[PDB]
């Protein structure tokens, strides 16, 4: 069964830092370029971070770029968000994603409605 | 209450997912088997069947 | 000498060899793969085997005459072997010039290249190609138009030469120069420039753009193309129309040699437009 | 209180697990490591059905294993005479993008399907002599991907509304609706019985139906992306399924799991087709990589290649007599091998 | 050798020549194109002549020609919000016509993800992108304005400079030309990162009183067919 159990998250002061983890199982980790996404309450689904199967290609949205860093391990095979210097406007449920595929570059559905190869989500407040 | 309602369709699913009577997995590679070796000289894939016969020469 | 001899008829036997098995296999890679079905194809398959059937018909006895001087056939097998040969050469050449054209609006007008070269049309031009040629090549011949009005100097030409002795008077030499090589190898040099010069614009463009936002294949192409059909037929025909001016005064070795350049034009005629491009590679690799 | 259901439905998920794995007696590769290998299958081209003009996206062998028929792009829907090569029927589809074509086992019907969410039944046998639309099958919401004959009334149709259907044919409305696929279903394929079938969703799961009761028997999970192509063991015991994590997966029906796992270093494209021989010893499965495989069913040994393709395999289908394989692809040819 | 033979031999002679003439009467001068955006996008209305609707619920064509040529557009309306598997059916289009809402900030991440994964996709690498950038009379008000700041969901806008190449409109401010060739570039940053030579991204900037919206699909698609051509023929 492919599961993706997300941790870290909770209350955090305005500038703080939160360092998100996914425990990816059931599939290799190597083979999948990994996401990361997170909802907004009253807003959709928002694609904030990627990075490659390998780990050079890594891209970031604007309104994070620079303060969150995305790392993986294929060896332990999770994922992580280093969330410092947050701001109140990042208070979202982050879901990890994995692209559908292996061996693409390419990835459609990640920030879909009902997404089957996402995470249950980690809550993330600010206050 | 969507959410509350799914997820209690999802237990009950797997409730009845897991009220079932699974057989070993010996039982079946044997009934497996013994199904492929049956109905193995009836295959013309398995045997290649002589050019009279077949009906794509 | 006999080994010059020996070794002029192996080397014109190796070209007439070559000929035959590259147009042969376009023939038969064409005509046996329904992919390879279009209509271009369809002309270039033409093409061969006009080729192929001026390497079976022409170039075996114009071998025994270039080397031997002697025409050992006669005088209405050589009526039939010149006409034939006029023939053939000049449906080569119009098939090339059809061949670029077809090209040329695939480039051009490609939004209605399917549309404007269609199957209808490919076949009227191969028609053309196979009937004009036809025509002019034995009403110039077998009514003997090329040596009327200079018929006496024709008689020394021929004796002096051999049994055949290809002659054209100054009139049916300028009239076959236009109609074989000049009016096809001048639409096949314009339409050739016009599409080089589209590729180049694209190609820079396409670089341009890209290093902007960070090889001469044209060349190569068209060159090739190009270079084989004026190495192989310029010569031949500048000293043709030229021998009847200047009180025939070239040697008959360079016209030999100039002859078979012009031959070799159907030898390397489906290597530049059949083995080039990936598509045949690809089917005859699949067979 | 959806902390308290997600830690029953976990709980529940390890009962599950920690019963497979009580179930887990053995291992197919172990049982059948005795077995004599098949050798070397060599399939080669016996005939190729010209005459479609685009990309080929489905095909459906006749029970009387000697008609077929299939779809394209180009908005045909040709029955083909396989035995020789004749086109006995041409039917033109409203829409071109169509995916998937079925043939009715009594033989009077051919069904069709794709981006238009709508099943259309041709009726192959009429008075006149013409096909024309029977009905259509409507109340999808998303583009049908797979529908199967259960008679010349009863049709189940897969969609990609995450949901599959069973149709009266006569009534034109569904008689039954499957849910509990969270992705779009791709491929379903019918029991021998024709009371259970299964079905293969965009969310690596396969899942049991029961025709008649409309409910979800049971749940396969053991593929890491979406799945492409199913069918059933003759037996009707067991299935294999093709996803594109270039893996062909076989579960077992009574052992409630995977019994084996086809799959190489070598290949990573993803498969569009599985299909199995008349004994089913053979599982031949359609790869994005223009040609197919020949697996072994017991010995997970691959046993051939269907090489002969110019483009993507898209359909792969078995006579129910066994004697022939007819694939199509994207180069708009089908090609029957024995 | 039977009657029976020879009349279904006949049947299906007349059925192989009726396909031919189908198939030579569809595929002359008809390109197929597949328009994609967002709700926001209008894509419903980036050609306004010849809307002429054949919907089947699940898909809205429009048919349109330009100089004799036809041209067949496809909006696949009626799917879920998934498309990683209905897409693949639309692998020869010609070209893909990609729709932008350029004012909208908060989702232009979102268009550009979309975009990439198309360009990217395995099955969409031989297709052209004809993206029109919509909305170029909103995004101008929205820069004009000032109120929204594209810094914020941008960063790299501060360290960019307007193009030389650009082709600024006589009455447009110095902002707009940046930001609307800032968006430009964000899109043919992405298009040229990975293209390999067998497609294209041709950018055009459009409002929703543009009429000339089908004469730029039909010359782009010229070049389109153009270039093919030539990679076939070898001369690029
Ligand atoms: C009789 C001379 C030939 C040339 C030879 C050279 O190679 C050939 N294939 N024919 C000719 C052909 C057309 C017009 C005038 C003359």
């Known amino acids: 069964q492919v599961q993706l159990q997300e941790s870290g998250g909770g209350l955090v002061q305005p500038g703080g830092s939160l360092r998100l983890s996914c425990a990816?199982?059931?599939?290799?980790?190597?083979?999948?370029?990994?996401?990361?996404?997170?909802?907004?309450?009253?807003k959709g689904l928002e694609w904030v971070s990627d990075i490659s199967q390998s780990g050079a290609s890594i891209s970031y949205t604007?309104?994070?770029?620079?303060?969150?860093?995305?790392?993986?391990?294929?060896?332990k095979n999770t994922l992580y968000l280093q969330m410092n210097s947050l701001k109140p406007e990042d208070t979202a449920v982050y879901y990890c994603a994995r692209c559908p595929a292996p061996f693409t570059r390419d990835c459609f559905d990640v920030t879909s409605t009902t997404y089957a190869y996402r995470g249950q989500g980690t809550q993330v407040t600010v206050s | 209450t969507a959410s509350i309602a799914q997820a209690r369709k999802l237990v009950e699913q797997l409730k009845m997912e897991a009220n079932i009577d699974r057989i070993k997995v010996s039982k079946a590679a044997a009934d497996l088997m013994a199904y492929c070796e049956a109905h193995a000289k009836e295959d013309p894939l398995l045997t290649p069947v002589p050019a009279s016969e077949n009906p794509f020469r | 000498s006999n080994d010059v001899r020996a070794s002029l008829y192996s080397l014109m036997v190796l070209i007439i060899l070559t000929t035959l098995v590259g147009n042969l296999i376009v023939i038969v890679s064409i005509s046996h793969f329904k992919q390879l079905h279009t209509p271009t194809n369809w002309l270039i398959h033409s093409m061969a085997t006009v080729d192929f059937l001026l390497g079976c018909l022409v170039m075996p006895y114009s071998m025994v005459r270039s080397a031997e001087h002697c025409w050992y056939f006669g005088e209405v097998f050589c009526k039939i072997h010149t006409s034939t040969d006029i023939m053939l050469?000049?449906?080569?050449?119009?098939?090339?010039?059809?061949?670029?054209?077809?090209?040329?609006?695939?480039?051009?007008?490609?939004?209605?290249?399917?549309?404007?070269?269609?199957?209808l049309v490919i076949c009227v031009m191969i028609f053309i190609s196979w009937s004009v040629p036809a025509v002019f090549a034995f009403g110039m011949i077998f009514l003997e138009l090329n040596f009327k009005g200079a018929e006496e100097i024709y008689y020394k030409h021929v004796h002096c030469r051999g049994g055949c002795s290809v002659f054209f008077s100054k009139i049916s030499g300028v009239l076959t120069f236009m109609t074989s090589f000049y009016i096809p190898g001048s639409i096949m040099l314009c339409v050739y420039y016009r599409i080089y010069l589209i590729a180049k614009e694209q190609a820079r463009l396409i670089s341009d753009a890209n290093q902007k936002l960070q090889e001469r294949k044209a060349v190569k192409t068209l060159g090739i193309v190009m270079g084989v059909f004026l190495i192989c037929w310029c010569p031949f025909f500048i000293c043709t129309v030229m021998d009847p001016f200047l009180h025939?005064?070239?040697?008959?070795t360079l016209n030999d040699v100039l002859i078979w350049f012009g031959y070799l034009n159907s030898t390397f005629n489906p290597m530049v437009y059949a083995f080039f491009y990936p598509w045949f590679r690809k089917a005859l690799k699949m067979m | 209180e959806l902390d308290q259901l997600r830690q029953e439905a976990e709980q529940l998920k390890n009962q599950i697990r920690?019963?497979?794995?009580?179930?887990?007696?053995?291992?197919?590769?172990?049982?059948?490591?005795?077995?004599?290998?098949?050798?070397?299958?060599?399939?080669?081209?016996?005939?190729?059905?010209?005459?479609?003009?685009?990309?080929?996206?489905?095909?459906?062998?006749?029970?009387?294993?000697?008609?077929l028929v299939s779809a394209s792009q180009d908005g045909k829907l040709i029955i083909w005479d396989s035995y020789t090569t004749n086109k006995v029927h041409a039917i033109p589809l409203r829409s071109s993008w169509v995916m998937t074509c079925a043939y009715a086992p009594s033989?009077?019907?051919?069904?069709?399907?794709?981006?238009?969410?709508?099943?259309?039944?041709?009726?192959?046998?009429?008075?006149?002599?013409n096909v024309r639309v029977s009905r259509e099958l409507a109340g999808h919401t998303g583009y049908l991907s797979c529908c199967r004959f259960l008679d010349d009334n009863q049709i189940v149709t897969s969609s990609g509304d995450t949901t599959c259907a069973l149709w009266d044919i006569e009534t034109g409305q569904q008689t039954t609706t499957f849910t509990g696929h969270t992705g779009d279903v791709m491929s379903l394929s019918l029991a021998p019985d024709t009371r259970l079938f299964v079905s293969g969703a965009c969310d690596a799961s396969a899942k049991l139906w029961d025709v008649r009761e409309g409910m979800c028997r049971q749940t396969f999970t053991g593929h890491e992306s979406d799945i492409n192509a199913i069918c059933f063991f003759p037996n009707g015991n067991?299935?294999?399924?093709?996803?594109?994590?270039?893996?062909?997966?076989?579960?077992?029906?009574?052992?409630?799991?995977?019994?084996?796992?086809?799959?190489?270093?070598?290949?990573?494209?993803?498969?569009?087709?599985?299909?199995?021989?008349?004994?089913?010893?053979?599982?031949?499965?359609?790869?994005?990589?223009?040609?197919?495989?020949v697996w072994d069913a017991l010995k997970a040994d691959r046993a051939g290649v269907l090489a002969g393709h110019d483009n993507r395999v898209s359909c792969l289908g078995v006579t129910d007599d066994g004697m022939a394989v007819a694939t199509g692809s994207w180069d708009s040819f089908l090609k029957i091998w024995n | 050798v039977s009657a029976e033979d020879k009349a279904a031999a006949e049947r299906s002679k007349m059925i192989d020549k009726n396909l031919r003439e189908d198939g030579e009467?569809?595929?002359?001068?008809?390109?197929?194109?597949?328009?994609?955006?967002?709700?926001?996008?209008?894509?419903?209305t980036i050609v306004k002549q010849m809307r002429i609707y054949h919907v089947n619920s699940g898909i809205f064509e429009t048919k349109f020609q330009v100089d004799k040529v036809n041209f067949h557009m496809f909006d696949v309306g009626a799917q879920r919000d998934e498309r990683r598997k209905w897409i693949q059916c639309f692998n020869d289009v010609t070209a893909i016509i990609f729709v932008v809402d350029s004012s909208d900030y908060n989702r232009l991440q979102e268009a550009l993800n979309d975009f990439k994964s198309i360009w990217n996709n395995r099955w969409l690498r031989t297709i052209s992108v004809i993206l029109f950038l919509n909305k170029q009379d909103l995004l101008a008000e929205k820069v004009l304005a000032g109120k929204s700041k594209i810094e914020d969901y941008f960063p790299e806008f501060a360290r960019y400079t307007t193009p030389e190449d650009a082709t600024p409109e006589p009455g447009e401010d110095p902002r707009v030309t940046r930001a609307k060739y800032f968006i430009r570039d964000e899109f043919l940053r992405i298009s040229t990162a990975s293209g390999d030579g067998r497609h294209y991204c041709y950018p055009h900037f459009t409002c929703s009183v543009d009429t000339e919206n089908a004469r730029r699909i039909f010359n782009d698609c010229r070049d389109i067919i153009q270039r093919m051509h030539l990679r076939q023929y070898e001369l690029l």
Request: with cysteine; net charge positive; aromatic share 10%.
């Open chain 3, 248 to 252: 025939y005064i070239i040697p008959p």
């Open chain 1, 24 to 42: 990816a199982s059931g599939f290799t980790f190597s083979n999948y370029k990994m996401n990361w996404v997170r909802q907004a309450p009253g």
């Open chain 1, 62 to 75: 604007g309104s994070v770029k620079g303060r969150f860093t995305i790392s993986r391990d294929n060896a």
């Open chain 5, 25 to 44: 009467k569809a595929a002359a001068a008809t390109h197929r194109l597949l328009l994609l955006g967002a709700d926001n996008s209008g894509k419903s």
């Open chain 4, 238 to 293: 067991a299935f294999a399924t093709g996803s594109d994590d270039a893996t062909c997966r076989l579960f077992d029906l009574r052992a409630d799991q995977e019994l084996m796992t086809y799959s190489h270093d070598n290949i990573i494209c993803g498969i569009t087709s599985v299909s199995f021989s008349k004994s089913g010893r053979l599982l031949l499965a359609g790869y994005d990589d223009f040609n197919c495989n």
């Open chain 4, 18 to 67: 920690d019963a497979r794995k009580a179930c887990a007696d053995a291992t197919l590769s172990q049982i059948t490591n005795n077995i004599d290998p098949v050798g070397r299958i060599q399939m080669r081209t016996r005939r190729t059905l010209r005459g479609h003009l685009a990309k080929i996206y489905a095909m459906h062998w006749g029970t009387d294993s000697r008609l």
């Open chain 4, 107 to 129: 033989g009077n019907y051919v069904a069709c399907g794709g981006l238009d969410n709508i099943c259309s039944i041709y009726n192959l046998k009429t008075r006149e002599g």
């Open chain 3, 89 to 119: 050469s000049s449906a080569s050449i119009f098939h090339l010039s059809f061949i670029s054209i077809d090209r040329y609006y695939a480039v051009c007008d490609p939004l209605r290249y399917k549309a404007k070269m269609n199957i």
